[PDB]
Amino acid sequence: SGFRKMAFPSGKVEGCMVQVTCGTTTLNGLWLDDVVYCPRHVICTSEDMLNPNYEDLLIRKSNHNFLVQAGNVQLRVIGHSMQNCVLKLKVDTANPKTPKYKFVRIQPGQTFSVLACYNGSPSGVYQCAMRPNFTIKGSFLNGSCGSVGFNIDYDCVSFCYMHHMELPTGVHVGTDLEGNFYGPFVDRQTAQAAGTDTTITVNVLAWLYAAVINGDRWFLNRFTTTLNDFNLVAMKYNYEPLTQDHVDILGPLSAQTGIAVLDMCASLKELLQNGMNGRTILGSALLEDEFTPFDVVRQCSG
Amino acid sequence: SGFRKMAFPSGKVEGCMVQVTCGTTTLNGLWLDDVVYCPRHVICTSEDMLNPNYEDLLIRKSNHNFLVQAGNVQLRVIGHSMQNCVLKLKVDTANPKTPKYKFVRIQPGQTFSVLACYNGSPSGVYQCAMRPNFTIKGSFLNGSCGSVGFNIDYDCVSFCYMHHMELPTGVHVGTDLEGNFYGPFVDRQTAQAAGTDTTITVNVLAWLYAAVINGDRWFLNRFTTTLNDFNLVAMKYNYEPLTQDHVDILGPLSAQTGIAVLDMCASLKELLQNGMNGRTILGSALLEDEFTPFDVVRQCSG
Numbered sequence A, B: 001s002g003f004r005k006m007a008f009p010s011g012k013v014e015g016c017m018v019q020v021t022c023g024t025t026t027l028n029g030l031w032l033d034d035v036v037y038c039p040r041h042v043i044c045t046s047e048d049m050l051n052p053n054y055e056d057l058l059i060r061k062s063n064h065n066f067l068v069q070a071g072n073v074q075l076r077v078i079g080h081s082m083q084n085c086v087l088k089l090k091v092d093t094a095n096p097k098t099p100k101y102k103f104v105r106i107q108p109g110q111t112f113s114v115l116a117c118y119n120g121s122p123s124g125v126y127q128c129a130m131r132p133n134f135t136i137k138g139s140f141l142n143g144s145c146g147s148v149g150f151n152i153d154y155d156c157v158s159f160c161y162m163h164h165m166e167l168p169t170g171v172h173v174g175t176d177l178e179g180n181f182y183g184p185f186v187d188r189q190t191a192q193a194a195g196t197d198t199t200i201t202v203n204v205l206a207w208l209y210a211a212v213i214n215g216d217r218w219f220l221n222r223f224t225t226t227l228n229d230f231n232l233v234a235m236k237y238n239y240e241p242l243t244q245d246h247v248d249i250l251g252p253l254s255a256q257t258g259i260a261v262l263d264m265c266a267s268l269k270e271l272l273q274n275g276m277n278g279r280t281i282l283g284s285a286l287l288e289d290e291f292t293p294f295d296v297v298r299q300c301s302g
């Protein structure tokens, strides 16, 4: 038993991380087949970053201006292109460690593992949820751009995130591997708002199910509610409204515990209205919303 | 910026995980050079586990009774020995993926990454602290024994933990890689107590420093205290007593923030006596004690 925020084993991705330098700017690139993907602001000087014209900036760059290092091994760049907010550098050597992989655009409320990297070398791994407002709450310093987020399904790595920027609020934003930002963000160093940060209701319920599965049951009560009644409470508390699809997604957990979803909703409502009274649930004194139902099932079944 | 519980990249360890079967019992083994390490209760039947005589049980076992699989590849076992609570199976092939490594016995209050595994295949990675009472708060199911805990220093893997058992309280216990349990535990399926679970004071202070570094400063106050005054508060709250060595360990963080350690102690005291008033620190509504000072520095400096 026990329930912990858990990342995927990162070895398959470690073997794809490279260092990309252009001028005095260094960040990380992702090397798959004979293509290296990285954030296009690798071409900016610190001055260019306030209002970059990326087309003009790129035009002064040639292949030999992109220095790509895999370990101590330098790679030969034979082509370059800009796709949205990422550069694709064509190299002359296919990565021998390329895993089976795909590029995917995750949906808000889904989770993925971040392999935080500096100078092309992995630093650490941790789980993140793509929040409803298309931000993530990570740990990123200067030089971490190009670090990627991923999921693993048996042997296939699904890359879903590349890191680009930190907002004034301290939350983190980035793109998919086609270089389209998640959310209303642009890669320029100007103040940018993410808007209200709502709570992922179906994930809170999943984590309450995980809590019950793991012996934490004090918050259960004799009440039930309706979807429309509950959702009127979610409104007040900036929770996402619950839908039958969410109910259906919770089915396996509902059946595996014998607690109707709307009975669990009634417990959540009382927690939202009455607080936790200084108690904890799965070691936390707040309601946790960065576990998906799949996260809870995968971890409660190995 | 940002502060997250972060595990080491696990690739070096993924390449060492194998499956070990004896009879109808399967768990994980660690394959380094030509030796495979695993928990000795792989030889028990479910009945033997209530009161096993491991010497007698082992004697009925020969090399060919230990089935060791690396991926789809079966390994040939040429020798077996029992060292404390672990088996060492000698195989005829050195692991070609053996990293540079050492075996270390960690101290209570230190942290390490767990690579949770089933049937010899990595499932997920997460950070754990060895608590003062020699338990860890993990996520382990049937079949997870032999999963290991480790730290990485540039290229050297320091293995410090192998998983064996879950206590009635739901916390987790295990051995070092010489097979000596951390704590007063035995590998038998009988009720076993860990004793009082005290809080790692120096780690709470490190995390308060991490909070200040990351903009969370509301808990700072105009007061200071003394080591003996503070420790009288730690007593009431089952905190470990603070020592000058702890003060010295905190020096870099104290100097990097300009907050004297005893000023930070005074803040902790008020938090302990007055609670958090419904506020949060680094996204938490409790005081977190599973980050070491080194953890905070490593993560706030890449």
Ligand SMILES: *[C@H](O)[C@H](C[C@@H]1CCNC1=O)NC(=O)[C@H](CC(C)C)NC(=O)OCc1ccccc1
Residues within 6 Å of the ligand: A027, A041, A044, A049, A140, A141, A142, A143, A144, A145, A146, A163, A164, A165, A166, A167, A172, A186, A187, A188, A189, B001
């Ligand atoms: C890429 O390595 C970097 C990651 C930032 C640095 C601190 N935390 C992060 O996530 N991205 C940038 O520096 C980015 C560049 C633009 C051209 C997109 N600018 C940015 O994030 O500005 C905000 C900021 C910069 C430095 C420290 C704190 C916030």
Ligand SMILES: *[C@H](O)[C@H](C[C@@H]1CCNC1=O)NC(=O)[C@H](CC(C)C)NC(=O)OCc1ccccc1
Residues within 6 Å of the ligand: A001, B027, B041, B044, B049, B140, B141, B142, B143, B144, B145, B146, B163, B164, B165, B166, B167, B172, B186, B187, B188, B189
């Ligand atoms: C090894 O795979 C296993 C790990 C337990 C299973 C559930 N969570 C864990 O950490 N260890 C054992 O099953 C262990 C065997 C003894 C001979 C040491 N017994 C054990 O931990 O008993 C407590 C327990 C068993 C099953 C479910 C929950 C608790």
